[PDB]
Design a protein around this ligand. Structure first.
Ligand code: MG
Lengths: 1327, 542, 49, 79
DNA sequence: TTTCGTGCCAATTTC
DNA sequence: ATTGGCACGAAA
């Protein structure tokens, strides 16, 4: 089953593994995020609802009134996307929010509702996302890039001995909220716990506990297990737990039941512990020195004296033991602090801790956060409460709470957004457990610890940022009591919200101009992940480990698509099948393997879930029922891969291309390329410029259609039907009767984009690919965009290539190109440039755009129309006038000289200047479009009226088509009734069409009225004036189109990392040729293959040769008229070739017309698909070569075009897919002799556009110093630079034929002297 | 004039940072003067004095004390110290380096026809770069009587200004520079040749000094103006003066790639080639036979060779003898100067042999014969590399027939050691080390088998016997000559890729047992990406 | 090349000779930098005689 | 930071043409005086007697000033 | 009291 | 980030 678009030209697929999951829609990451932001959520988890509920209700300090949020709504945009791009405005919708103000009474319990007033208010404009995932901010498309940031929660890390000279690991924990302040707990080389707040001065870790209303006994009970000493009238008879003595040496004699298990000088072993457990040894006799180090837990007070004998957390001595013995105490509580497992850290911290109450801790915290001011109990309490326990300043979001609970091994997922005492205590306990040796630190580069934040979430955050300022303004203005007269509309102002939204969507770090070289550039830009941006990393502070490939990237982040340079590893690309959780974690699909057979149910697993299973590889053999045939299956288990049994497999990969991205899946024979060259080719593939004619790859992977259709460059049928009208600029489809809505003329009108300018000054142009009367279905391609051929991506051209050295012209990546390639315009591109002329208002009257310029000649005004604007189609060069403008300079004073001048030459010439728009030097092209924008209230000129009539004609034509269809239907209804009533049909056929019946006449009148209203509305929109700027009267934009041809110095590339520069254009009779006299197009150097190890280009060349041979056979069969049976037999042989491939093409179901159309499309070579890691084998390539009567080795004998002598060895000749990159030597060449200089430094400016000079930096100065070229260096430093007098002396000397200089002093040194003197330092030259 | 105001469209005369700081200082000073005049209370004048102190501190050095004051867009204002210091300060931006006049830049292509002292300069660039010289030359010969006449003539680009330009650029060096200039060989002087197009043509032999390749590199060109600068360019910076490395004294004009491949191909012998065994009068007869298709470039023949040696006083004395050589070696002998022995070419010439030949020529004869010899070597290498027709195909990467058995035996040994581990005889780390050693031995065996199969071929003798000679495989020829490729890369092409390491550094125990001719699967490719990106990141960050 | 001047109403310390780590004023007067800053920014007094 | 760009005015163009014309020192001083007294519309704003006075040398007559003015009037633009 | 350990702060990072 | 120098506090 093939669609109409695919049935015209079927691409032969060499894939062998059946598809179980279809490639998803490639732009879901943008559309889903923005829809979550915009759609109204009844519960309010995401979007504008959450932002509104997180601020409202807003109440005054006195509590007399509050503002309550009800609902919100988005209005219809004034203009659509195309109108916004034409005018240069934002595509946005107005936000109307229903607020409600309530008034409460006094001298009543709680608040009595005196009055409630509800009204909707205008909150500003929200930019809208288009159908292709972009934003039109100022007439230009923009993309907001998703961000890979650190997830909220608690993370445990360490330093691997790098901080300390002794190489001791110091563990730490950090709590990071979504909104709030960080909380750090860290260890010391002395093993003391410390707490840090907001990355500020270190504090002991017991300060926070004391501020949380904890006493010393409670802290010791929390962090230690009590040991009970009972004074059984004989030397402190002891109860012993056998497990306590593990890895311990007895410093005394341990005996039980009259038997000495452990003697003096003997340690305790595991067998001894087992014996003690078996015998249930409890009673133990210990000496008085066994307490010489034991630390008391609680406080003991003598009953009689009533004084405090000792404080908590202090080791006891002999005197203290005697005092407690004589005081009649029979219970002692101690802490078990063995140095092996239960290290004494909290006790040491308490020893370090000076504070012993709750207020001193608050004072210390207040002084740490806000030093240099007196402490107050109320202020300190408020600060501590607001730090971590205020829902308005601290938020541990749902993902943050989930991660917190998962790290603490809790059960519940839901929870509160603020910290509590239990959370901090558990974090401390887990850190101490990690210190003791039971626990692991977290891997921060693990993709389970990193989150994806998209455009909707960032927009919500910025909206809340504006909304809190709005709340502050409301609370400031709500103190005044005037509740009987004010209204919510005048109470709130939308300026902060609109400003925040504008600054997010226009000048953010992750908001960028869309890359529009080709559809692949746009797809890659919209699927891009960045670690930079606000709240991310810095490319200087990043490091090596964050830039590395992690195992968890498998199936989620492409490992071979990242820029090379400072941003390597920081900008990533999404994989083909990757998704995100509801928490923003990347996940990938897998097939579930049950009872040893691979099923077809798909589960999306994240990085945390993935590592708990054994997942089989994609390149794993199966059977007719789905059983592994290899006894040792290669699988990934715990971030590592190894061989596993057939019954230990849990999941399997869905595809062999789920690990690469969209750009890397378009490289054929990727598995034969080195990874560095694969990265280079993936980067180079998305900077190719579209040419005049599109050429399908002829060797592909099968992903071209997905890229072409999921991009918005093509015209895709919304409904099925028949092509009623087809034209170079519009398509009209007559929709089928079963897809039409009631009471509707069913037609779809598609207006094609014709020769418009992209963000890269290239051409965007759509061409129809359907014919008149042919059937179409939903989803079919109607028109091809740039770099698209019949619905497939086509980035380059197919070139006949030979790999051999040719006289040094392909030395070091150089490329030798034939003259026929230039003659056939195969790499010719169109570039469009825009120029603007702005007419403003001055004090001496306004500037006038006109053709009556006095000072210029009659020839220079030949290209201007009556309105002073250049004609459409005019060929212009540098210096020509495009828009004629004059600036007033009139003044009342008139000397006799001015009177004579005006009398002789006329008054128009005087009191006016010439500020016309001219073509910049070195610029040429053809005027293809002129746009005029006029301020409202200003008289329109003739050109603007002509443009308006042009715009009105198209809308009139569309409305006329719809009205014509509707009136034809209505008259068909009228005629049937008229005949049924009984009339003569001939009189109806003779009379004109003016002609129950009254009801249909009323319907006719209503239809006419409705279409007149539509036309009037469209005319009113078209004739609407512009709002340009303060003081701007008129704007005129001119578009120039030029064609660039291929030439030496232009950069060419393939898809396998092979790039080069054209060195020579070789005439046709100089190129190598084969036995039939066919020359090659391009000669490439073979020496570039073995060192780079990009073997995929040789295989691609051989397969392209085979495909072109099949196409040659088809073309030869077409030229001599052959019966359709022969053609379909040969094409069936071609499609059936392969080794158990998954594609079945049956031409018996094809009609003769369809077969002939396919054969006509296949006469330039049969396209072939080789999926990545599932491509063709060399045996299949050789079979296809044998089918087309070509040498199996892929090498033929060539002859020298200059001598006719055969080369001594066979040469690899075939077809490659070449790309023209946007690095044109036309933009690179620049020279300067003299020009303009800076005002301050008096040095030449920089840049080709400024006609600037080349910088002679410090390294060049060092190179000249190492040569000894003192005069060349002094000439560089003064005469070619900021030395003003020598500059003019040298020019005069050179013109006179005297090559000598007088150096002088540079100006920048004088500037430096003045700047140093401005600092109050006396610096001067002496002698 | 050192702190100017910025005029923009619409009449907005915006102020700079220094003017703002000066305005703040002046406002505070005026308010303080008025307050001191009016005898204000001390509590107010103290605050005003503190604010004046802060304003002066912000003017002199903004941000050194306290918090830096910001402008309209939340960015701190630039003070005098910020102008003095830093990478964007006066010293490093305007005094230690600066932009200059009479300079241009563009993309570089290759000129294989050029001599070592010549460059290819576009004439559109040269017309702009040499404009005052053209004005002077136009006025000197009466074509233009004033400066505006010459200016208009050059603007119109008349047919005579091109003759004037070719006259004025005749012997006038230009300096070519490629960034970064890591050493003094990054700037060199060349004599221009006016060419059509927009790209600069660079001599191949100087590409190593610049560290340049023809895939997008750009170069800048500067014009010396005074006589001293021109003579310094000719006598110090000229390419023909820079043939030894100042760092270590090694040569820097080493031929590479296509030249090495061509010279290696022509100076090789085949066992049974066309025209073998005939006796020739000299190299000219050898070339005459080769061009006629009567003898092969590799046929082993006897040639009468005359060689000159420098006497004790220093005179060249000639000795003539019959030598056993090949046709290609005799043909190449016509390029060597007269002071060298014939044994320097009677061998297969790799990269090292060609460098040795150049060094011997420089040591025995001097500088001018050496540069002439280098140009002739480059020309001959290019010509015969073109004539050879050397290509690369899929059949060149020959997989050894014994690789599968080696892999199976290694897998069996690994299974045996794993079973021994599961039996409790061995520990974990020692088993890991044993597995690593097993795979290393297997990789070494595969590499040895691949190289043994690749490096030899079988040929038919004159009688009809079988001999073994050095292989004419294209990949083997490229690797053996030193033109391109090493043993490790050929091993990756035709043998197993071997063991891979994690980003931390630990070796993954199971290796990639596939080469690039039969591609890797998904897991092996993902494993290789680790080392690929580690190397790329190190290169980017060092 | 022509400079102007401003007559300050009250003396002001140069920040280069105060905030550079080997403080010239602090070393010359043999006083800590904190006390000098406190006096300069009108936060404490210092006895002159 | 902002610095700006130098612009070439009518007087700058006239002085550039004066520098590249074979004048003597006295003729060059007279030409500098003449170019100084030229307004934006290209007309001489002072009589030749004022220029002769501004020269400051008493051995120069009005004929030399007239000849230098005639030479300058043929610069670009003519007139 | 004098000497040594320890925290704070400034300056550096391509073209 | 890293490194070096200066203040501050604690050791014998
Ligand atoms: Mg390069």
């Amino acid at each position: 089953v093939y669609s109409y678009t695919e049935k015209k030209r079927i691409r032969k697929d060499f894939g062998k593994r059946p598809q179980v999951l279809d490639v998803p829609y490639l732009l879901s990451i943008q559309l889903d995020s923005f829809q979550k932001f915009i759609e109204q959520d009844p519960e309010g988890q995401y979007g504008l609802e959450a932002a509104f509920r997180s601020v409202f209700p807003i109440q005054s300090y006195s509590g007399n009134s509050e503002l309550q949020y009800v609902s919100y709504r988005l209005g219809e945009p004034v203009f659509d996307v195309q109108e916004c791009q034409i005018r240069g405005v934002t595509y946005s919708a107005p936000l109307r929010v229903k607020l409600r103000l309530v008034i409460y009474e006094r001298e009543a319990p709680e608040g009595t509702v005196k009055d409630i007033k509800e009204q909707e208010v205008y909150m500003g404009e929200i930019p809208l996302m288009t159908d292709n995932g972009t934003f039109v901010i100022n007439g230009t498309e923009r993309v907001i890039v998703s961000q890979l940031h650190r997830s909220p929660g608690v993370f445990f890390d360490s330093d691997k001995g790098k901080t300390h000279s002794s190489g001791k690991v110091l563990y730490n924990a950090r709590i990071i909220p979504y909104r709030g302040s960080w909380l750090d707990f860290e260890f010391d080389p002395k093993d003391n716990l410390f707490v840090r707040i907001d990355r500020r001065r270190k504090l002991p870790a017991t300060i926070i506990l004391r501020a949380l209303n904890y006493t010393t006994e409670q802290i010791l009970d929390l962090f230690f297990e009590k040991v009970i000493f009972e004074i059984r009238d004989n030397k402190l008879q002891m109860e012993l737990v056998p497990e306590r003595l593990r890895g311990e040496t007895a410093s005394f004699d341990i005996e039980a039941n009259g038997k000495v298990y452990v003697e003096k000088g003997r340690r305790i072993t595991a067998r001894h512990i087992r014996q003690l457990e078996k015998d249930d040894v409890k009673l133990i006799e210990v000496p008085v020195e066994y307490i010489a180090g034991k630390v008391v837990a609680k406080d003991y007070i003598d009953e009689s004296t009533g004084e405090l004998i000792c404080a908590a957390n202090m080791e006891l001595s002999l005197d203290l033991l005697a005092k407690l013995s004589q005081s009649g105490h029979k219970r002692i509580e101690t802490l078990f602090t063995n140095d092996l497992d239960h290290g004494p850290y909290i006790s040491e911290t308490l020893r370090v801790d000076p504070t012993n109450d709750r207020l001193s801790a608050l004072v210390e915290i207040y002084r740490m956060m806000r030093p240099g001011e007196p402490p107050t109990r109320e202020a300190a309490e408020s600060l501590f409460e607001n730090l971590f326990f205020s829902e308005d300043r601290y938020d541990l979001s749902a993902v943050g709470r989930m991660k917190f609970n998962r790290s603490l091994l809790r059960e519940e997922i839901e929870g509160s957004g603020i910290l509590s005492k239990d959370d901090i205590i558990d974090v401390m306990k887990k850190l101490i457990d990690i210190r003791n040796g039971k626990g692991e630190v977290d891997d921060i580069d693990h993709l389970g610890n990193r989150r994806i934040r998209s455009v909707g979430e960032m927009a919500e955050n910025q909206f809340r940022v504006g909304l809190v300022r709005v709340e502050r303004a409301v609370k400031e203005r709500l103190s005044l009591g005037d509740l009987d007269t004010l209204m919510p509309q005048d109470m709130i102002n939308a300026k902060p919200i609109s400003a925040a939204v504008k600054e997010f969507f226009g000048s953010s770090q992750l908001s960028q101009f869309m890359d529009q070289n080709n559809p692949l550039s746009e797809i890659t830009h919209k699927r891009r992940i960045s670690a930079l941006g606000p709240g991310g990393l810095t490319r200087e502070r990043a490091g090596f480990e964050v830039r590395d490939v992690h195992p968890t990237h498998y199936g989620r982040v492409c490992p071979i698509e990242t820029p090379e340079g400072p941003n390597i590893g920081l900008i990533n690309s999404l994989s083909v099948y990757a998704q995100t959780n509801e928490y923003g974690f990347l996940e990938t699909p897998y097939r579930k393997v049950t009872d040893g057979v691979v099923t077809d149910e798909i589960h999306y697993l994240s990085a945390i879930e993935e590592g708990n299973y054994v997942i089989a590889q994609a390149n794993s053999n199966l059977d007719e029922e789905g059983h592994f045939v290899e006894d040792l299956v290669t699988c990934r288990s715990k971030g590592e891969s190894s061989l596993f049994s057939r019954d230990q497999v849990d999941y399997m990969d869905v595809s062999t291309q789920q690990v690469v991205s969209v750009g890397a899946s378009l490289i054929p024979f990727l598995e034969h390329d080195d990874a560095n060259r694969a990265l280079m080719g993936a980067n180079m593939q998305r900077q190719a410029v579209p040419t005049l004619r599109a050429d399908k790859p002829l060797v592909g992977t099968g992903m071209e259609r997905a890229v072409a259709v999921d991009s918005g460059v093509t015209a895709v049928a919304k409904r099925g039907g028949v092509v009623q009208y087809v034209d170079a600029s519009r398509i009209v489809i007559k929709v089928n009767e079963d897809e039409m809505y009631p009471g509707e003329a069913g037609i779809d009108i598609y207006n094609l984009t014709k020769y418009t300018r992209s963000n890269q000054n290239t051409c965007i142009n759509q061409m129809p690919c359907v014919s008149l009367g042919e059937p179409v279905e939903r989803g079919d391609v109607l028109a091809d965009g740039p770099s698209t051929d019949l619905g497939e991506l086509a980035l380059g051209q197919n070139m006949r290539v030979a790999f051999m050295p040719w006289n040094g012209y392909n030395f070091e990546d150089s490329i030798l190109v034939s003259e026929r390639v230039v003659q056939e315009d195969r790499f010719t591109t169109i570039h469009i440039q825009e120029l603007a002329c702005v007419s403003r208002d001055t004090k001496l009257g306004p500037e006038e755009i006109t053709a009556d310029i006095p000072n210029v000649g009659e020839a220079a005004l030949s290209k201007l129309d009556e309105s002073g604007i250049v004609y459409i189609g005019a060929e212009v060069t540098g210096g020509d006038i495009l828009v004629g403008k004059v600036t007033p300079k009139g003044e009342t004073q008139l000397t006799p000289e001015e009177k004579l001048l005006r009398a002789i030459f006329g008054e128009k010439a005087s009191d006016v200047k010439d500020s016309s728009l001219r073509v910049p030097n070195g610029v040429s092209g053809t005027v293809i479009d002129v746009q005029v924008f006029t301020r409202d209230g200003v008289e329109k000129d003739k050109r603007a009226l002509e443009i308006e009539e042009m715009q009105l004609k198209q809308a009139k034509k569309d409305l006329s088509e719809e009205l014509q269809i509707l009136e034809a239907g209505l008259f068909s209804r009228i005629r049937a009734v008229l005949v049924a009533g009984g009339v003569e049909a001939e009189k109806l056929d003779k009379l004109p069409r003016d002609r129950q019946l009254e009801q249909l006449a009323e319907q006719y009148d209503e239809l006419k009225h409705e279409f007149e209203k539509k036309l009037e509305a469209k005319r009113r929109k078209i004739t609407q004036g512009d709002d340009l700027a303060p003081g701007v009267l008129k704007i005129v934009k001119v578009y120039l189109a030029v064609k660039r041809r291929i030439q030496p110095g232009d950069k060419m590339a393939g898809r396998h990392g092979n790039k080069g520069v054209i060195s020579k254009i070789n005439p046709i009779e100089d190129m190598p040729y084969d036995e039939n006299g066919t020359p090659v197009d391009i000669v490439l150097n073979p020496l570039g293959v073995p060192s780079r190890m990009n073997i995929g280009q040789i295989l691609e060349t051989h397969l392209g040769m085979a495909a072109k041979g099949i196409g040659d056979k088809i073309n030869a069969m077409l030229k001599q008229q052959q019966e359709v049976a022969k053609l379909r037999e040969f094409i069936q042989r071609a499609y059936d070739l392969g080794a158990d491939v998954r594609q079945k093409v049956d031409l018996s179901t094809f009609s003769d017309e369809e077969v002939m159309r396919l054969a006509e499309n296949l006469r330039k070579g049969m396209p072939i698909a080789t999926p990545v890691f599932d491509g063709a084998k060399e045996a299949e390539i050789k079979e296809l070569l044998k089918l087309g009567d070509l040498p199996t080795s892929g090498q033929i004998r060539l002859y020298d075009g200059r001598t006719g002598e055969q080369f001594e060895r066979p040469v690899t000749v075939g077809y490659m897919y070449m790309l023209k990159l946007n690095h044109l030597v036309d933009d690179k060449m620049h020279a300067r002799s003299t020009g303009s200089y800076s005002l301050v430094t008096q040095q030449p400016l920089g840049g080709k556009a400024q006609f600037g000079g080349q910088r002679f930096g410090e390294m060049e100065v060092w190179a000249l110093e190492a040569y000894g070229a003192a005069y060349t260096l002094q000439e560089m430093l003064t005469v070619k630079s900021d030395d003003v007098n020598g500059r003019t002396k040298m020019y005069k000397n050179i013109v006179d034929g005297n090559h000598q200089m007088e150096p002088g002093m540079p100006e920048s040194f004088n500037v430096l002297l003045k700047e140093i003197r401005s600092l109050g330092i006396n610096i001067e030259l002496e002698d | 004039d050192l702190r100017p105001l910025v005029p923009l469209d619409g009449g907005r005369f915006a102020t700079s940072d220094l003017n703002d700081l000066y305005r703040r200082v002046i406002n505070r000073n005026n308010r303080l003067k008025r307050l001191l005049d009016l005898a204000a209370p001390d509590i107010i004048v103290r605050n005003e004095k503190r604010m004046l102190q802060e304003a002066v501190d912000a003017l002199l050095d903004n941000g050194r004390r306290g918090r830096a004051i910001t402008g309209s867009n939340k960015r701190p204002l630039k003070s005098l110290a910020d102008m003095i210091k830093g990478k964007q300060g006066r010293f490093r931006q305007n005094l230690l380096g600066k932009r200059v006049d009479y300079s241009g830049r563009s993309v570089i292509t290759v000129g294989p026809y050029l001599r070592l002292h010549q460059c290819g300069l576009p004439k559109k660039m040269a017309l702009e770069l040499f404009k005052p010289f053209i004005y002077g030359k136009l006025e000197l010969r009466g074509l233009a009587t004033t400066i505006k006449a010459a200016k208009k003539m050059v603007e119109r680009e008349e047919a005579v200004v091109w003759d004037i330009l070719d006259e004025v650029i005749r012997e006038h060096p230009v300096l070519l520079n490629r960034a970064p200039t890591l050493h003094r060989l990054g700037i060199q002087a060349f004599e221009p040749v006016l060419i059509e197009g927009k790209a600069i043509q660079l001599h191949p032999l100087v590409c190593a000094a610049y560290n340049a390749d023809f895939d997008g590199d750009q170069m800048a060109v500067h014009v010396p103006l005074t006589l001293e600068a021109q003579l310094e360019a000719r006598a110090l910076m000229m390419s023909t003066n820079n043939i030894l490395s100042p760092a270590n004294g090694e040569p820097i004009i080493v031929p590479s790639q296509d030249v090495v491949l061509g010279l290696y191909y022509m100076t090789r012998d085949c066992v049974n080639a066309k025209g073998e065994g005939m006796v020739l009068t000299g190299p000219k007869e050898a070339e005459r036979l080769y061009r006629s298709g009567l003898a092969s470039l590799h046929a082993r023949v006897k040639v009468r060779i005359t060689e000159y040696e420098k006497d004790a006083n220093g005179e060249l004395v000639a000795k003539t003898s019959l030598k056993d050589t090949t046709v290609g070696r005799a043909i190449l002998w016509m390029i060597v100067p007269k002071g060298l022995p014939y044994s320097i070419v009677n061998q297969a010439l790799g990269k090292k042999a060609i460098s040795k030949m150049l060094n011997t020529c420089y040591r025995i004869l001097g500088l001018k014969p050496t540069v002439i010899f280098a140009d002739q070597i480059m020309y001959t290498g290019f010509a015969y590399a073109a004539r050879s027709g050397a290509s690369v195909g899929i059949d060149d990467m020959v997989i050894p027939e014994k690789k599968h058995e080696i892999i199976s035996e290694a897998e069996a040994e690994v299974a045996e050691i794993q079973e021994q581990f599961q039996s409790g005889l061995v520990t974990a780390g020692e088993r890991y080390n044993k597995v690593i050693d097993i795979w290393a031995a297997a990789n070494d065996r595969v590499s040895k088998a691949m190289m043994d199969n690749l490096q030899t071929e079988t040929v038919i003798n004159r009688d009809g016997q079988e001999e073994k000679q050095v292989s004419f495989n294209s990949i083997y020829m490229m690797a053996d000559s030193g033109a391109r490729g090493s043993a490790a890369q050929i091993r990756q092409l035709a043998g197993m890729r071997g063991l891979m390491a994690k980003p931390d550094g630990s070796i993954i125990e199971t290796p990639i047992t596939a080469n690039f001719r039969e591609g890797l699967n998904v897991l092996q490719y993902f494993i290789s990406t680790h080392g690929a990106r580690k190397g790329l990141a190190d290169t980017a960050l060092k | 090349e022509r400079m102007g001047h401003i007559e300050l109403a009250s003396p002001t310390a140069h920040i280069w000779f105060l905030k550079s780590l080997p403080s010239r004023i602090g070393l010359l007067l043999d006083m800590p930098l904190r006390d000098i800053e406190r006096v300069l920014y009108f936060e404490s007094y210092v006895v002159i005689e | 930071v902002y610095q700006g760009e130098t612009t070439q005015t009518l007087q700058d163009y006239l002085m550039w043409q004066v520098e590249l014309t074979p004048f003597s020192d006295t003729d060059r001083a007279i030409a500098t005086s003449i170019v100084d007294a030229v307004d934006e519309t290209g007309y001489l704003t002072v009589p030749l007697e004022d220029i002769l006075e501004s020269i400051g040398d008493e051995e120069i007559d009005i004929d030399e000033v007239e000849a230098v003015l005639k030479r300058i009037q043929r610069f670009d633009p003519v007139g």
